[PDB]
Amino acid sequence: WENTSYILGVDAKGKQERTDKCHAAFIAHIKAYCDTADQDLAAVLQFHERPAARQAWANCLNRQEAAFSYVTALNYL
RNA sequence: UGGAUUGAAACGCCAUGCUCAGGCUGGCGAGUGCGCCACUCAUCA
Structure with a gap:
């Protein structure tokens, strides 16, 4: 997917x-090993785990969609 | 005897705590002070 950045690394x-x-x-x-809405046959991220909670955050800011959501969440705010 | 998001998967190679440096230079335990005074080995076969 798209790239997370801006961590001290x-x-x-x-x-x-x-x-x-x-x-x-x-x-x-x-x-496709980690298929989260990339190949839409099954998504790990909602279709106690971190990127599902991230996606839960990236739809708290809005009042491949899963990948987009949680990687813009890791891209803080 | 198919199939554990499995099965395979070193943190591994090497490295001076070294070179050297007085605990020295000096300083009375001294100045004084009765062991003193007095006492039958006695009495007897």
Whole structure:
């Protein structure tokens, strides 16, 4: 998905993403292993876990949609 | 005897607490003070 940034770290780049081979399970493409509204056959994020709570925040500010929501949540406010 | 988001997966290689430096230089335990006074080994085969 899109990139989380602005944490005190090394590159300020995204999390929950696969860029290597040894993170391949039940072979999926590159980011279908963690499918959250990217491939819309099943979403982990609401369709005690953090990115679901993030998405719960990114719809508290508004009075792939799940990825958009929680990665703009990690992008604080 | 298919299938545990599994199965495979070193924090690992190396490194002086070293070089050297007086605890020294001096300072009376001294100045005085009766052990003193007095006492039958006695009485007897």
